[PDB]
Amino acid sequence: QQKPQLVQTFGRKKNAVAVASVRPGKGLLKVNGSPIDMINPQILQAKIYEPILLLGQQKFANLDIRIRVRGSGYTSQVYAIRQALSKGIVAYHAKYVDENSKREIKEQLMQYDRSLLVADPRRMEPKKCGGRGARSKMQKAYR
Template sequence: MNRTGTILDLGFFLGVWHWEKGFGEGERWVSERQQRRPEEVIAVALADASIHGAIGFERGGAFEVNGVPIELVKPEILRLKAFEPVLLLGRQRFMGVDIRIRVRGGGKTSQIYAIRQSIAKALVAYHQKYVDEQSKKEIKDILGRYDRTLLVADPRRCEPKKFGGRGARARFQKSYR
């Protein structure tokens, strides 16, 4: 028996896999995880060297950054900056959406800016996909009027060093004698 057949048989035995009759797409094996998949959207934000991916789920309105509640994000001074989209739009717009954010790279400040951008982009994407176009437009207008960087990533990146100098543009001093 091939490898996938054994995995399916084992999954069926353990109750993880079951046979599902699809509507218009035929019959297939479905895992328990696929069956209970909530409505979700994925938004990616870049700020300086930080990369963030936010996933918006249909649930109770919690925010997590690397598995930790957003209320515990450090540094405390910039924590309010991460909450800007929530403060601008009001907590009621976020009540049905859980947002999980993964962050890596960059410094603390760029991470905070990327967190706020990914929260804003995830909410806009969620409203576009699962709510209606009108509410998405309202959210984009409110966020865009306050600060455009909540929706648009900063394209500036560090330029790599070239030969003939100490940095990207600096050259070694030239001597004629």
């Protein structure tokens, strides 16, 4: 079967899931089969470029990384991509490099943001009856 040089990490925010696959070579980032350039709301593309700029391109020119994302809505999706990418490099440096590098990129990243290696525990709140929402309730008449 010839076990590949693959690493596979996942990342999560709300209902969104990102699976990033990392293999060695000339660095690509393709999300859902397309460059980061084309990710829908333009503003938060910089969110995905963040861990890249934080680690420096030097780590990323050595690796082709392809991230498929399926999930909730635009923003959470962006955050999932972020996550998967980040802990993806970490997992690579775990299997194929020394542990030391894994450690120092871990610290490197988390000093900037912890949302990269750790997932946002928040999810939606179910709705309580007698309201238009998960707390707020039908208006009341006292007098």
